[PDB]
Structure 1
């Protein structure tokens, strides 16, 4: 199909420190896709999502489609890039069990299933999730703490994948939920210590959705990544950063710079529908990063992917 990588920009509101430290709101929103910082040039994306916009609405805006797609046969990835404290974890997962405050992952959980349940008796679906976080170029099963430093490979079709990953099976959004809760717990067994730990730790949630209609025996499938990157502020980022920057404009892409990269390789260069949610801060306290981030999203919006079924 050859469709572009969508990019959305979500701005948190101002925090206490900022609110109390006076500060002020930098971004100016014109149209429903363009943002403006102070005097400078105007940044334009697939959608811009100010503070006031709900998570529900954030969802319909970025995830909702990616989900219908995976169920059609294509792969999908939706990650959140941005400097620490910007909103990534709130937008990717949110308050897990609040029907209002819950982020994307859980909502996708519900959407996937709401969708399946409704389909015909034929074509059964095999959904298996896996969960793991990266830290210093090396992996770590979130569902099996014992294991750390697992590694990647190229399938039959010769494309990469984390191997030896504890793939759990789910039949309802609830399971998917439990599974996430497991991880977040299995994490809490860790000393360096949490807030710190994350900070530079990207967590990956994989949802491998496979279906076959039994009657016609025609199959389908797709991997749907829900990455929540760690801070971007000034090492895999750089890997990432280049891996795309080498995509804006015959060049050769250094996927191999980092596993991560090596992982979402098909999400940046492969038959895969991809969206990016860049989270930003409105306080001038970070006007810098704001430029790099935006700039980062900007570059991405250019990169076009070729995506096919099966």
Structure 2
């Protein structure tokens, strides 16, 4: 099966002598596929832990590529980047020209792999949205900022954002051109109140469709870069909670504990309503939890959340429509 898999990626150290003069502290270490704390008794087991030396390419090839292949076969696939601000989420998901992230790699990979299937026909379209302060803005637009999450897909009642721009692309060059714009149009935002980046979620989605030479395979591939988890989580004001991150973890815990039907509060947040099907539904989900050794509380929180997600159960299948 392996419908749900979790891994951890550790941000490399720019040192071992540095900041707090002659040193800050390293609270975590990873050996084989376990991550334990320096001087403490907490340890965590994951079926894969990438160390500071391993490259985004390797993370992509081991984790993401199988999801892409599955997407091409008609399976819904979702991938999240979760972790503290500055732990490597965007580096892993978007990256640079020197070190392409998972999103651009997936695009290049998809266009190269559909060619290995001449008998069938391919239809691809992309979307790019941002979720901030409960409000959903379209990143390939002209100005209706806030859209609603409707349900009218009476074919299992699938969720969707009230007609958000969906652009048809034939080349990876065009796909990436939309990303670039979306990235840019992220700052005609910024000074509504900034570093809004570390406080918002972004979802890049690609809908794939295919047929031979009567039934059409249809799959949704969501690629998620979440908000900083330092604001994820009994308490008074001693931090600053992000509603979505909190509801995300709350929904994950319940699923891992055995709850279903309606004991799962997907509706208490936009994030969890939108990505509802990815949390215990009809998709292959993977979570990449980025961590930084020099952090203790934040790393601990993310590890607990990553650990809990290992036990989530999804039931994926091919989606062919008559």
TM-score w.r.t. length of structure 2: 0.89
Q: Tell me the SS of whatever aligns to 2:8.
A: strand
Distance change in 2, residues 1:309/1:282 (3 Å): same
* Structure 1 position 135 matched with structure 2 position 136: no
Confirm or deny that 1:240 pairs with 2:248: yes
Stretches of structure 1 lacking an aligned partner (at least 5 in a row): none
CA displacement, residues 139-187 of structure 1 (integer Å, 9 cap, x when unaligned):
0000014121111122132021112110011112111111100101112
Q: CA 1:111–1:194 in structure 2 vs 1: closer, same or farther (change >3 Å)?
A: farther
2:128 and 2:305 map into 1 onto residues whose CA distance is: 26
RMSD over equivalenced CA pairs, Å: 1.8
Pairs within 5 Å for 1:293-304? 293-304=302-313
What is the correspondence of 1:248-287 to structure 2 with a 5 Å cutoff? 248-249=256-257, 251=259, 252-283=263-294, 286-287=295-296
Please list every run of 5 or more consecutive structure 2 residues that lacks an aligned counterpart in the other structure: 232-242
CA distance in 1 between partners of 2:168 and 2:41 (Å): 50
**How far is 1:250 from its partner?**
5.5
Corresponding residue for residue 102 of structure 1? 100
Using the alignment, how far apart are the partners of 2:28 and 2:187 within structure 1? 37
**Alpha-carbon distance, 1:248 to partner:** 1.2
Asked if the contact 2:74–2:318 (Cα under 8 Å) also holds between the matched residues in 1, the reply is yes
Query: Per residue, is there more helix in 1 or in 2?
Result: 1
1:229 is aligned, of 223, 226, 230, to: 226
Shift of residue 213 of structure 1? 0.9
- State the TM-score, normalized to the length of structure 1: 0.92
Change (3 A) 1:19 1:145: farther
Does the CA-based 8 Å contact 1:141-1:148 persist in structure 2?
yes
- CA deviation string 1:19-42 (max 9, x = no partner): 3331243332222x2211123232
Whether the 8 Å CA contact 1:145–1:187 is kept in 2: the answer is no
Q: Name the structure 2 match of 1:204.
A: 203
Match of 1:187 in 2: 186
- Of residues 18-27 and 232-241 in structure 1, the stretch that sits farther from structure 2 once superposed is 18-27
